[PDB]
Amino acid sequence: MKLSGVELRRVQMPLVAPFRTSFGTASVRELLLLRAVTPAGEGWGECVTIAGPLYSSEYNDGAEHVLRHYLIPALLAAEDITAAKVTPLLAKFKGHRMAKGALEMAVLDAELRAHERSFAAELGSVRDSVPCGVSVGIMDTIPQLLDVVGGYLDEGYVRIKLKIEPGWDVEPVRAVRERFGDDVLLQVDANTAYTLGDAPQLARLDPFGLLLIEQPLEEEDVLGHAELARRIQTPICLDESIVSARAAADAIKLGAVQIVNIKPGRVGGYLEARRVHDVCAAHGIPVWCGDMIETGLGRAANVALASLPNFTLPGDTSASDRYYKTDITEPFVLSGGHLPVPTGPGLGVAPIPELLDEVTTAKVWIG
Amino acid sequence: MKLSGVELRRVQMPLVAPFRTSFGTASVRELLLLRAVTPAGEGWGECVTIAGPLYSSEYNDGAEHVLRHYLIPALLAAEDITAAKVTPLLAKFKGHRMAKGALEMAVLDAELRAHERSFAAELGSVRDSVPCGVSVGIMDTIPQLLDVVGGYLDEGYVRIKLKIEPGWDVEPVRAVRERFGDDVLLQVDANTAYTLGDAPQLARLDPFGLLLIEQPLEEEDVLGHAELARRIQTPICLDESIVSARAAADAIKLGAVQIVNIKPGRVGGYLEARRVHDVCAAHGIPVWCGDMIETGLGRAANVALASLPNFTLPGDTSASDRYYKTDITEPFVLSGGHLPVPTGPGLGVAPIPELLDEVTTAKVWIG
Amino acid sequence: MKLSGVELRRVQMPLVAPFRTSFGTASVRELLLLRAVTPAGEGWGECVTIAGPLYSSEYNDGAEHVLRHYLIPALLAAEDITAAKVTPLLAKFKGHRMAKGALEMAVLDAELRAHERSFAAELGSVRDSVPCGVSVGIMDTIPQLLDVVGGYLDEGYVRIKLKIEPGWDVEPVRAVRERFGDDVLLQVDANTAYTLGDAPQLARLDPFGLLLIEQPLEEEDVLGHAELARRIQTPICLDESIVSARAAADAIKLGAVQIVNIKPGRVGGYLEARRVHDVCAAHGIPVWCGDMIETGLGRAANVALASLPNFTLPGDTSASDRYYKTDITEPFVLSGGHLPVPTGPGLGVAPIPELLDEVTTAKVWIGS
Amino acid sequence: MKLSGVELRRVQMPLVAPFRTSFGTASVRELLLLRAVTPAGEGWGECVTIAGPLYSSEYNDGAEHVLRHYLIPALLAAEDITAAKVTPLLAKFKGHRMAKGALEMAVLDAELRAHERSFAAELGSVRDSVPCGVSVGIMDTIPQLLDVVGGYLDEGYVRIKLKIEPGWDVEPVRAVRERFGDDVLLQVDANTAYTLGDAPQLARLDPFGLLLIEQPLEEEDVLGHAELARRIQTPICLDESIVSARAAADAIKLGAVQIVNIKPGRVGGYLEARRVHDVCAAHGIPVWCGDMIETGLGRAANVALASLPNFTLPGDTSASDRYYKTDITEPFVLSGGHLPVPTGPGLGVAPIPELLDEVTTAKVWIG
Ligand SMILES: CC(=O)N[C@@H](Cc1ccccc1)C(=O)O
Ligand SMILES: CC(=O)N[C@@H](Cc1ccccc1)C(=O)O
Ligand SMILES: CC(=O)N[C@@H](Cc1ccccc1)C(=O)O
Ligand SMILES: CC(=O)N[C@@H](Cc1ccccc1)C(=O)O
Ligand SMILES: CC(=O)N[C@@H](Cc1ccccc1)C(=O)O
Ligand SMILES: CC(=O)N[C@@H](Cc1ccccc1)C(=O)O
Ligand SMILES: CC(=O)N[C@@H](Cc1ccccc1)C(=O)O
Ligand SMILES: CC(=O)N[C@@H](Cc1ccccc1)C(=O)O
Ligand SMILES: [Mg+2]
Ligand SMILES: [Mg+2]
Ligand SMILES: [Mg+2]
Ligand SMILES: [Mg+2]
Structure with missing residues (x-):
C-alpha cells in the first residue's frame, strides 16, 4: 500500500443533551476525521481528542498539527506500509497516541477494505x-x-x-x-x-x-x-x-x-x-x-x-x-x-x- | 467459511543427519499434515508432534486420533467458522494443543488465501x-x-x-x-x-x-x-x-x-x-x-x-x-x-x- | 518379579441415574480395567479416564493406546519390577498420569497379594x-x-x-x-x-x-x-x-x-x-x-x-x-x-x- | 499383631578408633536394642540415643525409662497394632522421638517379616x-x-x-x-x-x-x-x-x-x-x-x-x-x-x- 495522501476534516456535531463530566460540560462534539487515500481506495479514521487539554494533554488543534507536520509526512515518505508498520514508522515521535491511533485506523480501514x-x-x-x-x-x-x-x-x-x-x-x-x-x-x-x-x-x-x-x-x-x-x-x-x-x-x-x-x-x-x-x-x-x-x-x-x-x-x-x-x-x-x-x-x-x-x-x- | 472436510496425511521424511536430544535420537521426521477444504479453496496445516510422548504428552497417533474423532467433527458441525472461532469451538476439549494448533493453521491458511x-x-x-x-x-x-x-x-x-x-x-x-x-x-x-x-x-x-x-x-x-x-x-x-x-x-x-x-x-x-x-x-x-x-x-x-x-x-x-x-x-x-x-x-x-x-x-x- | 503381561478390558456399566457436571452428562460409565499377570499372581487396576477429553486431556481410547504401545512394553522390557520402580521405568513418557496410575495399581495389587x-x-x-x-x-x-x-x-x-x-x-x-x-x-x-x-x-x-x-x-x-x-x-x-x-x-x-x-x-x-x-x-x-x-x-x-x-x-x-x-x-x-x-x-x-x-x-x- | 511384649537390651560395643565430634569423644558405642515379640514372631529395633544428652535431649537411660513405663505399656494395652498405628497410639507423649522410633522399627520389622x-x-x-x-x-x-x-x-x-x-x-x-x-x-x-x-x-x-x-x-x-x-x-x-x-x-x-x-x-x-x-x-x-x-x-x-x-x-x-x-x-x-x-x-x-x-x-x- 503506497499512501497517496490524507484528508483532515474538522467536524462539529450537536449533542442531544449536555454531557457533564468532572472536567467540564459539552453541548457539541468537535472532532478530527481522516480520509486516507491509496491507489486501491479510501479508508476512514477518527481522532478522539476534544477541544482543549482537559481529559489528557492532547487536543484537536494539537492533533491536527502533529498529524500534518510529523505523522502523515513520515508515512508518505515510506515505501511499503501496512497498519502494523505504522507503529515503528512513527515510534521516534513521543506520545501523541490519539493522533497516531486515528491515523492507524484510517490505514487499517483502507488495508482491510482492499482484502x-x-x-x-x-x-x-x-x-x-x-x-x-x-x-x-x-x-x-x-x-x-x-x-x-x-x-x-x-x-x-x-x-x-x-x-x-x-x-x-x-x-x-x-x-x-x-x-x-x-x-x-x-x-x-x-x-x-x-x-x-x-x-x-x-x-x-x-x-x-x-x-x-x-x-x-x-x-x-x-x-x-x-x-x-x-x-x-x-x-x-x-x-x-x-x-x-x-x-x-x-x-x-x-x-x-x-x-x-x-x-x-x-x-x-x-x-x-x-x-x-x-x-x-x-x-x-x-x-x-x-x-x-x-x-x-x-x-x-x-x-x-x-x-x-x-x-x-x-x-x-x-x-x-x-x-x-x-x-x-x-x-x-x-x-x-x-x-x-x-x-x-x-x-x-x-x-x-x-x-x-x-x-x-x-x-x-x-x- | 463452512468447512467441507479435512484430509489427514502421515508423512515420513529422512533427515540429512541424526538429531540427538536429551530425550532420544531421530534419523527421520514423522509428522501429520492437514488439508482443510472449503467452498473457497484449500489450506494447509502441520502438526509438530513426534512419534512418541518424549518431548510432551502429545504424539502422532494421539494427535491423529483426537483430530479425527473430536476436533475436526466439532468444526464440521459448526455453521460459520473463522480461525478466531476455532478456539471457542474446541475449548471444551482439554489440552491437545499441538493438534488444535495444526487445525487452526489449516483453517487460517484457507481464510487468508481467500482474502x-x-x-x-x-x-x-x-x-x-x-x-x-x-x-x-x-x-x-x-x-x-x-x-x-x-x-x-x-x-x-x-x-x-x-x-x-x-x-x-x-x-x-x-x-x-x-x-x-x-x-x-x-x-x-x-x-x-x-x-x-x-x-x-x-x-x-x-x-x-x-x-x-x-x-x-x-x-x-x-x-x-x-x-x-x-x-x-x-x-x-x-x-x-x-x-x-x-x-x-x-x-x-x-x-x-x-x-x-x-x-x-x-x-x-x-x-x-x-x-x-x-x-x-x-x-x-x-x-x-x-x-x-x-x-x-x-x-x-x-x-x-x-x-x-x-x-x-x-x-x-x-x-x-x-x-x-x-x-x-x-x-x-x-x-x-x-x-x-x-x-x-x-x-x-x-x-x-x-x-x-x-x-x-x-x-x-x-x- | 518379571511382569508376564497385562490384560486390557473395556467395560461399560449403566448408572442408576444420570450424572451431570459442568462438562457434560453421563448415563453410563465407560472404563479400562487392567489385569497384571506375574509369576507370583494377578493384580487388578482401574483407569479413571472417561470417553472424551472433557475433564482432563486423557481419555479411554488414548489411555488404551498409550498403555498398549508405550507403558506396558516398557515394563515388560525391564529385568526386575516393583510398584515403586514403575515410576522411574515410565518417567521418560510425559504425562499420561491416569494411564500410569492404573498400571501401577495393578502391579501393586499383584505385589501385595503375594505378600x-x-x-x-x-x-x-x-x-x-x-x-x-x-x-x-x-x-x-x-x-x-x-x-x-x-x-x-x-x-x-x-x-x-x-x-x-x-x-x-x-x-x-x-x-x-x-x-x-x-x-x-x-x-x-x-x-x-x-x-x-x-x-x-x-x-x-x-x-x-x-x-x-x-x-x-x-x-x-x-x-x-x-x-x-x-x-x-x-x-x-x-x-x-x-x-x-x-x-x-x-x-x-x-x-x-x-x-x-x-x-x-x-x-x-x-x-x-x-x-x-x-x-x-x-x-x-x-x-x-x-x-x-x-x-x-x-x-x-x-x-x-x-x-x-x-x-x-x-x-x-x-x-x-x-x-x-x-x-x-x-x-x-x-x-x-x-x-x-x-x-x-x-x-x-x-x-x-x-x-x-x-x-x-x-x-x-x-x-513380550 | 497383638503385641505380647518387648525385650530391652543394653549393649556396649568397642569402636575401632576414638570418634570425636564438637560435643565429645567416644571409644565405645552404648545403645538400646528392642526385641518385639508377637504370636507371629519377632522383630528388632535399635535406639540411636547415646549415654548423655549432648547431641539432643534424649539419652540411653531416659529412653529406657520412657519406653518401659509409657511407650511399651501403651502398645501392650492396644487391641490391634500396626507400624502405622504406633504414632497415634503414642501421640499423647510429647517428644521422645528416638525412643518412639526404636519401638516403631521393631514393630515394623515384626510386621514385615510376617508378610x-x-x-x-x-x-x-x-x-x-x-x-x-x-x-x-x-x-x-x-x-x-x-x-x-x-x-x-x-x-x-x-x-x-x-x-x-x-x-x-x-x-x-x-x-x-x-x-x-x-x-x-x-x-x-x-x-x-x-x-x-x-x-x-x-x-x-x-x-x-x-x-x-x-x-x-x-x-x-x-x-x-x-x-x-x-x-x-x-x-x-x-x-x-x-x-x-x-x-x-x-x-x-x-x-x-x-x-x-x-x-x-x-x-x-x-x-x-x-x-x-x-x-x-x-x-x-x-x-x-x-x-x-x-x-x-x-x-x-x-x-x-x-x-x-x-x-x-x-x-x-x-x-x-x-x-x-x-x-x-x-x-x-x-x-x-x-x-x-x-x-x-x-x-x-x-x-x-x-x-x-x-x-x-x-x-x-x-x-
Ligand atoms: C462515555 C464517556 O464518559 N466517555 C469518556 C468521557 C469523555 C467523553 C468525551 C470525550 C472525552 C472523554 C470516559 O469514558 O471517561
Ligand atoms: C467537544 C469539546 O471539545 N468540548 C469541551 C470540553 C468537554 C468535552 C467532552 C465532555 C465534556 C467537556 C472543550 O474542551 O471545550
Ligand atoms: C530444533 C530443536 O531443537 N527443537 C526442539 C527439540 C525438538 C526437535 C524435534 C521435534 C521436537 C522437539 C527444541 O527447541 O527444544
Ligand atoms: C521419528 C521420531 O519421532 N523419533 C523419536 C522422537 C524424536 C524426535 C526428534 C528428536 C529425537 C527423537 C521417537 O522414538 O518417538
Ligand atoms: C461415559 C463417558 O465418559 N461419558 C461422557 C462424559 C461424562 C463422564 C462423566 C460424567 C459426565 C460426563 C462423554 O465423554 O461423552
Ligand atoms: C463424584 C465426582 O463428582 N467426581 C468428579 C467428576 C467426575 C466424575 C467421573 C469422571 C470424571 C470426573 C469430580 O469430583 O470432579
Ligand atoms: C556419623 C556421624 O557423624 N553421626 C552424627 C554424630 C553422632 C554419632 C553417633 C551418635 C550420635 C551422633 C552426625 O551426623 O551428626
Ligand atoms: C558412649 C557415649 O555415649 N559417649 C558420649 C557421647 C558420644 C557419642 C558419640 C560420639 C561422641 C560422644 C557421652 O554421652 O558422654
Ligand atoms: Mg475515566
Ligand atoms: Mg527446549
Ligand atoms: Mg472436582
Ligand atoms: Mg550433624
Whole structure:
C-alpha cells in the first residue's frame, strides 16, 4: 500500500443533551476525521481528542498539527506500509497516541477494505453482537438524574455508569440504588477528580455494591491507586492511566487495577488495543470497551473491538441516538440491549457524504 | 467459511543427519499434515508432534486420533467458522494443543488465501527477513561437535544452540568456546534433563557467557526455575513450560524466566503464539522463534511469526537443507544469515504434489 | 518379579441415574480395567479416564493406546519390577498420569497379594472405617435437587457436594440451605467452569457457610486461584490442578489452596497419592478423597487411601449403589454414614468373573 | 499383631578408633536394642540415643525409662497394632522421638517379616545398592587427619565428611584440599558448635568448594540458619533441626536449608523418615542418609532407606568395619564404594546370638 495522501476534516456535531463530566460540560462534539487515500481506495479514521487539554494533554488543534507536520509526512515518505508498520514508522515521535491511533485506523480501514475483510475479523471477534451500557453525566439535581437513568433503563441499556466528582458521589449513588434497586449493574467514573486523601469519602460507596470506580486519581498516580485499593471495597478500574499494553501490565503487577477500560485512541490505536486486551486476559483481568462520543466510524470499530473474548463487562458503546439526532453513517440502534457487530469490509460503514458535509467545519489535503 | 472436510496425511521424511536430544535420537521426521477444504479453496496445516510422548504428552497417533474423532467433527458441525472461532469451538476439549494448533493453521491458511492476505500481514510482521541460528544435537565425541559447529558457522548461521544433558554440558561448551571464541552467540538446551539438585553443575556454565539455558528442569516446575535463577548466572529460557499466554505471564510474574522460546504448535496455534509475543513484549521479555524440524509449510509460518517486533534474538528457523535433502515445498535458503519472509497469500507456499506423494505413508478424508 | 503381561478390558456399566457436571452428562460409565499377570499372581487396576477429553486431556481410547504401545512394553522390557520402580521405568513418557496410575495399581495389587498384605496396610491406614459424603449433579429444576438431596441425607451421607456452573450456583445453594438448614455439611464443585471475572458471583456464596469450593477456575490457573481467594470467603479446594505432590507444594506456597482433593488416578497412582497426603499434612492442609465413579476395585483402593490420618474431611467415596445397581465386586454398603476399610490381601476385593464378563465390551492380551 | 511384649537390651560395643565430634569423644558405642515379640514372631529395633544428652535431649537411660513405663505399656494395652498405628497410639507423649522410633522399627520389622516383605520394598526402594561416604572425626593434628582420610579414600569411600568446631575448621579443610585435590567430594559438620557471630569464620570456607556445611548453629535456630545462608557460599544442611516432616517443610519455606540429612531415629522412625524424604522431594531439596554409628540392625534399615529416589548425595552409612571389628549381624562390606541393599524379609538381617550375648550388659522383659 503506497499512501497517496490524507484528508483532515474538522467536524462539529450537536449533542442531544449536555454531557457533564468532572472536567467540564459539552453541548457539541468537535472532532478530527481522516480520509486516507491509496491507489486501491479510501479508508476512514477518527481522532478522539476534544477541544482543549482537559481529559489528557492532547487536543484537536494539537492533533491536527502533529498529524500534518510529523505523522502523515513520515508515512508518505515510506515505501511499503501496512497498519502494523505504522507503529515503528512513527515510534521516534513521543506520545501523541490519539493522533497516531486515528491515523492507524484510517490505514487499517483502507488495508482491510482492499482484502475485503472486516475489522471484526482482523481483531479476532467471537460474537455477532455485544451488550451495551450507557454513561450518564453529572446533573444539577438528584430528581433530574433519576429521570434520565430511568429513561435509559427503559430503552434496555444493561448497565449504568455515573460520572462523579467531589460534591456528587454518595448522594446520586444512594438515590439510584433506592429508586431502582440492587440488581441494576451500576458503576462510577471520576475522570481523575479525587486524591488519596479522599479515600474516606470514596469508602462511603462501599455499601452500594458498585461494579467498579473508574480512574478516581490522576493519570500518573498508579501507586496511589494500589494504595487506594487497600482502603475501599469498590474495585478500581483505570482509564486515563492505561496508555499502552506495557502500562496495563505495570498497573496489574503493582495491584493498582482489577478491571481495565480499553479506549483505542487513548492507547494509540486498534492494534495496541488488541494487545491490551490480550495482556489483561493473560492475567485474568476483565476488560470493557470505552467510548469517547465517537461518530459511527469510531462506534463501528469499537463494537467490533468489544466482540473480542475478554470483553466480559458491558461497554460504553451506546446507540448513536444516545448522543446524536443525526449520525454521519447509518446509525447504530439498540436491540435487546445489544448492538450488532458490522459485517462488510473494513469498518463496515462509511460516511453518508451529504450528512458529513452539513457538519464539516474545515478540510485540508496533505499529499 | 463452512468447512467441507479435512484430509489427514502421515508423512515420513529422512533427515540429512541424526538429531540427538536429551530425550532420544531421530534419523527421520514423522509428522501429520492437514488439508482443510472449503467452498473457497484449500489450506494447509502441520502438526509438530513426534512419534512418541518424549518431548510432551502429545504424539502422532494421539494427535491423529483426537483430530479425527473430536476436533475436526466439532468444526464440521459448526455453521460459520473463522480461525478466531476455532478456539471457542474446541475449548471444551482439554489440552491437545499441538493438534488444535495444526487445525487452526489449516483453517487460517484457507481464510487468508481467500482474502489474498499473507500470514505475515495477519500476524503483524515489521521486517522482510529474519536472522537464523541453528540447533545442534548431542554427539558422540567433542571433535565431531567442533566439526559440525564449524560447518554451520561457515554457512553463515548467526547463533549456535547446543543440546545438553548430564555428562554432556560443561565439556562441549568449553570446547566450542576454546575453538571459536567468545564472540559467537552461544546458548544451550536441556529439554528438561536436570533437577534443582544439579544447580552446582549448571553453575559451572557461568564463565562461558551463554545467552541462555533453555528448559533445564521439568515442564511443570516453574517455581524450581525461579529458584534455579537465584543460583546461576546464565539466564533462564523456558520452552516446554510455556503452553499459553497465561502460562508466560505466570512464569514472568514468578521470576522463572528472562527469555521465552515461542513454538506455535506447543501453545495451540499461531494466534495464541501472537498473544504470547504480545504478553512477553509488555513485560520487557525478549522472545525468539523455535523450530520443531517442520517441513516448508510450518517453516513458512514460523518465519512469518519470527518477523514480529519483539523477536529480538535469532530463532531456530534454519534453512530447509539443515534437516532435509528435499523439502516438500520450495526450500528455504539461507542468505547473509537470514531467511526471507514469504509474500503470497496465506502461508505463501504449498506442497509440490509429486514431492509430497513420495513421502506420504497414509491418507484419510474426514467429511 | 518379571511382569508376564497385562490384560486390557473395556467395560461399560449403566448408572442408576444420570450424572451431570459442568462438562457434560453421563448415563453410563465407560472404563479400562487392567489385569497384571506375574509369576507370583494377578493384580487388578482401574483407569479413571472417561470417553472424551472433557475433564482432563486423557481419555479411554488414548489411555488404551498409550498403555498398549508405550507403558506396558516398557515394563515388560525391564529385568526386575516393583510398584515403586514403575515410576522411574515410565518417567521418560510425559504425562499420561491416569494411564500410569492404573498400571501401577495393578502391579501393586499383584505385589501385595503375594505378600498377603492389604492396600490399607501398605498406605498407612489408621482407622477401620471412613465417613462418606456424596456428590450430587446438576439437575433441571430446584425441586428435583431438593428431592435427591433429601434422599441422600435419609440414607445417612454425612456431607453434600453440589456440582455447579454459571446459571446454577447461588440458587441451588440457597434452596438447599432454606430446606435443610445450616448444620448440613455442604460444599460445591465447578470443574473449572468459572473465571476470575466471575469473582463477584462466587462471592454471593459467602453467606451460605460452605466448607469449600472445588476447582472454580481452569487447571493451569494456580495464580488465579490465589487471587480468587483474596476476594471470596469460601475456602478454595483444588482438584484438576493437583497433578503431583510437587504441584500441591507449589499451590500451597502460592496461597492458591486451603484444602486438597486427592484422586489417585489424576496424580499418577496410589503411591503418589500417599505423597500428596504427606506433603499436605506437613503444611497443615487438610485433604479428602475424591471419586471418579469407579467400580468396586477403585472404590476399595480409595476407601483404604481415605483411612490415612490427614483425611480429615469426608470424601466422595459413596456406596456402590449410589452409582450402580450391580457392582462387579462385593458391593460397598453405607452403614452409619461410613464405609468399612477392606481387610484381605491387596485391594481386598476382586471381580466376580460372571458379572465382569456381562459388562466387558472388549479384551486384549499384551505380552513380550 | 497383638503385641505380647518387648525385650530391652543394653549393649556396649568397642569402636575401632576414638570418634570425636564438637560435643565429645567416644571409644565405645552404648545403645538400646528392642526385641518385639508377637504370636507371629519377632522383630528388632535399635535406639540411636547415646549415654548423655549432648547431641539432643534424649539419652540411653531416659529412653529406657520412657519406653518401659509409657511407650511399651501403651502398645501392650492396644487391641490391634500396626507400624502405622504406633504414632497415634503414642501421640499423647510429647517428644521422645528416638525412643518412639526404636519401638516403631521393631514393630515394623515384626510386621514385615510376617508378610515376607523387606524394609526396602516397604519404603519404596528404586536401587539395589547405594554409594557410601564416611564421617571423619576431629583429630589432634593435621597429619593424623590426612592419614585417616587417605586411608578411607583408598578403601573406595566416595565422599569425605569432616567434623569441625571453633579452632578446627579452615585448617583441616585447606590441608585436605592441598593433599587430595579439588575433585574429592568434601563436606563439613559442626553439630551446632557455631553462632551467627561466627559467620566471617565460616565464610573463610567459601573457596574450598564444599558440598555443604551441616548444622552450623543450634537446633532451635532455624531463622539464624536462613540468615547465615545469606552470608556464606557453602550450602546449608540441617540435621539436629529436622525433627519431622513438618520441621523440614518449615525450614525450607524459611530459606534455612538447601540439603537435608535424614536420620530415622531423630525424626521418630523409618515411616516419618519416608515422609521427610517425600516432603523434601516435592520442594526440590536433595536428601542424604545419616548414621548414628548403629549396629548392623540400624545399618540395614538405613541402607534400605538410602535407596529411595531423592537420596541423591552419598550417605554416612559406612561399612560395619569403619566402626566395629565385630558387628552383631553379618557385617556390611564396602564394594566399589557401595553397600548392597538387604533382600530378605524385614531388616534382612538379625543378631547372631553368641555375638550379641558377648556385648549385652543388661536385659529386661516387659510383658
Ligand atoms: C467537544 C469539546 O471539545 N468540548 C469541551 C470540553 C468537554 C468535552 C467532552 C465532555 C465534556 C467537556 C472543550 O474542551 O471545550
Ligand atoms: C462515555 C464517556 O464518559 N466517555 C469518556 C468521557 C469523555 C467523553 C468525551 C470525550 C472525552 C472523554 C470516559 O469514558 O471517561
Ligand atoms: C521419528 C521420531 O519421532 N523419533 C523419536 C522422537 C524424536 C524426535 C526428534 C528428536 C529425537 C527423537 C521417537 O522414538 O518417538
Ligand atoms: C530444533 C530443536 O531443537 N527443537 C526442539 C527439540 C525438538 C526437535 C524435534 C521435534 C521436537 C522437539 C527444541 O527447541 O527444544
Ligand atoms: C461415559 C463417558 O465418559 N461419558 C461422557 C462424559 C461424562 C463422564 C462423566 C460424567 C459426565 C460426563 C462423554 O465423554 O461423552
Ligand atoms: C463424584 C465426582 O463428582 N467426581 C468428579 C467428576 C467426575 C466424575 C467421573 C469422571 C470424571 C470426573 C469430580 O469430583 O470432579
Ligand atoms: C558412649 C557415649 O555415649 N559417649 C558420649 C557421647 C558420644 C557419642 C558419640 C560420639 C561422641 C560422644 C557421652 O554421652 O558422654
Ligand atoms: C556419623 C556421624 O557423624 N553421626 C552424627 C554424630 C553422632 C554419632 C553417633 C551418635 C550420635 C551422633 C552426625 O551426623 O551428626
Ligand atoms: Mg475515566
Ligand atoms: Mg527446549
Ligand atoms: Mg472436582
Ligand atoms: Mg550433624
